[PDB]
Design a protein around this ligand. Structure first.
Ligand SMILES: Nc1ncnc2c1ncn2[C@@H]1O[C@H](COP(=O)(O)OP(=O)(O)O)[C@@H](O)[C@H]1O
Ligand SMILES: [Ca+2]
Ligand SMILES: [Ca+2]
Ligand SMILES: [Zn+2]
Length: 548
């Protein structure tokens, strides 16, 4: 702790607008990973000037960005998760403080500009932007340069110096103030000028861009970033599309490939060479008959539809839904103790979340108290529960899980999932809540707010064991659309009795009991709403279109 000790805070924004409008999983991953990369660029300045132990939060001890890009360790696929938060604080000597602010702003600025230059070279060379090698240099003109340059605001503030917590709660003040100090649009985000959008007409713009959807510098950077990463590391995310996550359901793709796979790729090539690339389907949505029927020789297409249906009949229907899991710690909250809680969170987000998600879906971000993952629907509930338990062992957590159809617009899905977390789970008194929602392709939306222990109770329950029945759920739910005049207890006893050898006597007794127990852990201020919660939950996890 030397010398002229100063406490310094860094915040990088925007986060949610940047990550928010992402039209594809790969973009979403790239937004998240790039943001964390920016924080790496920031903290590296402090490590260079002082040392790793000078960063109080986040704790750098296990950080894969530092192990790889700093020390050169070979860490493999772990590098694909973003673990670095957009806020940090460190201890620096007061004389260094301003020097450090400048150096950081600059390093982020220059990093982004370099990515952008590399990005246009890549774009022109790979034909994502169809333009001569002459006019590539118009893409580098001062305007777009200034867009890249000013896109992220990096706020830095420092207080001088056991009353530690006091001033610790101060810098978010000047740091709260600093964030507030300040042609044709892009077709992806919509929020920035498109590259050629100023010097050209619309048709003159849309035409020359790949898929007639021009990008601003920011989204061009997003598009290049996974290639940047696959060159700097040898790594690329295992599942590029949400369909690829969706099909992890019940190992459906593994078993399908193993049995019917080669035959399918051949049937598809037999239709057209353009559906098959490297003895694989060009699109994972091609595992769906529905896509062969609609979206785009019709006899050999019928042959693929027939083939698929047959295979479904043997192996089961194809999964069309996936889950977005969003988690955040509730009300989260002495310098050595600050380091202790920081290291606790770091171990959680780097080690433990990873160890529960693993290969079973895509972990995009673990930022200490925050998590973002895309999961197959049959892993969503247990991944959320297990991560919750892990966090408790380090303390409480709310989550939202949006189950959505593969064709639903990603930015809207993320908006909704994040809404589930913030406007529902977080608005329950005491919080510590899971908000589950299911947005059916038809457009009907089902939400249920439960407590974490509803998952364990339901897990162990005979009721669950039996549920794998339907008419039951439908009837109890039909009863609570408004409410039974006969009251809840009576309606429930009636309904249980109505759907169960004579061992029924005990079964009915235990179930009714279990339900009562389960009802305890559903959120809501009265029993009818608690039954609605419980039974909507049940309707969701048993839905045959969603869980086929
Ligand atoms: N690299 C990243 N990838 C994905 N999400 C991120 C990243 N960095 C920050 N975030 C998200 O941005 C949010 C900003 O958090 P914050 O401003 O503290 O709001 P709150 O007070 O609700 O926590 C966090 O919830 C975090 O999940
Ligand atoms: Ca929080
Ligand atoms: Ca948070
Ligand atoms: Zn854009």
């Amino acid at each position: 702790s030397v010398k002229d000790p100063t406490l310094l805070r860094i915040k990088i924004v925007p986060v949610q607008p940047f990550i928010a409008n992402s039209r594809k999983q790969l973009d979403l991953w790239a937004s998240s990973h790039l943001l964390s990369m920016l924080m790496y660029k920031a903290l590296e300045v402090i490590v260079d000037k002082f040392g790793p132990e000078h960063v109080i939060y986040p704790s750098l001890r296990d950080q894969p960005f530092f192990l790889k890009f700093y020390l050169g360790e070979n860490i493999g696929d772990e590098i694909l998760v973003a673990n670095l938060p957009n806020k940090a604080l460190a201890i620096v000597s007061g004389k260094e403080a301003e020097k450090i602010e400048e150096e950081i702003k600059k390093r982020i600025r220059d990093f982004l500009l370099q990515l952008y230059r590399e990005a246009v070279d890549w774009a022109v060379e790979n034909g994502v932007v169809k333009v001569d090698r002459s006019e590539k240099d118009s893409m580098l003109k001062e305007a777009y340069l200034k867009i890249v340059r000013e896109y992220f605001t990096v706020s830095i503030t420092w207080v001088s110096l056991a009353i530690y917590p006091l001033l610790v709660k101060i810098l978010d003040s000047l740091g709260e103030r600093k964030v507030t100090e300040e042609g044709w649009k892009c077709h992806v985000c919509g929020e920035n000028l498109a590259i050629f959008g100023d010097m050209y007409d619309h048709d003159n713009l849309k035409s020359l861009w790949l898929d007639e959807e021009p990008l601003c510098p920011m989204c061009l950077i997003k598009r290049y970033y996974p290639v940047w990463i696959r060159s700097k590391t040898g790594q690329k995310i295992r599942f590029e599309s949400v369909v690829d996550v969706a099909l992890l359901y019940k190992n459906w793709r593994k078993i399908f490939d193993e049995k019917y796979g080669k035959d399918l790729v051949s049937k598809a090539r037999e239709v057209s060479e353009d559906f098959v690339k490297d003895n694989m389907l060009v699109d994972s949505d091609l595992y769906y008959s529905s896509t062969w029927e609609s979206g785009l020789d019709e006899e050999k297409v019928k042959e693929v539809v027939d083939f698929l249906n047959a295979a479904y009949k043997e192996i089961g229907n194809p999964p069309k839904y996936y889950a977005i899991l969003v988690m955040d710690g509730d009300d989260m909250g002495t310098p050595q103790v600050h380091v202790a809680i920081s290291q606790a969170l770091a171990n959680f987000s780097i080690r433990e979340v990873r160890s529960v998600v693993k290969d079973e879906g895509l972990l995009i971000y673990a930022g200490g108290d925050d998590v973002l993952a895309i999961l197959p629907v049959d892993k969503a509930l247990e991944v959320a529960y297990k991560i919750r338990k892990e966090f408790g062992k380090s303390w409480k957590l709310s989550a939202g899980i949006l189950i959505v159809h593969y064709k639903h617009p990603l930015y809207d899905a993320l908006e909704k999932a994040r809404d589930l977390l913030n406007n529902k789970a977080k608005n329950v008194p005491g919080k510590d809540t899971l908000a589950i929602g299911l947005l059916k392709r038809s457009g009907s939306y089902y939400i249920s707010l439960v407590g974490w222990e509803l998952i364990r109770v339901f897990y162990n329950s005979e009721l669950r064991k039996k549920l794998l029945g339907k008419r039951f759920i439908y009837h109890v739910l039909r009863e609570v659309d408004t409410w039974p005049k006969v009251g809840i207890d009576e309606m429930l006893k009636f309904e249980v009795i109505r759907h169960i050898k004579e061992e029924t006597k005990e079964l009915r007794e235990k179930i009714y009991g279990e339900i009562k127990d389960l009802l305890e852990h559903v959120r809501g201020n009265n029993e009818v709403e608690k039954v609605r919660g419980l039974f909507t939950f049940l309707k969701i996890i048993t839905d045959a279109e969603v869980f086929p």
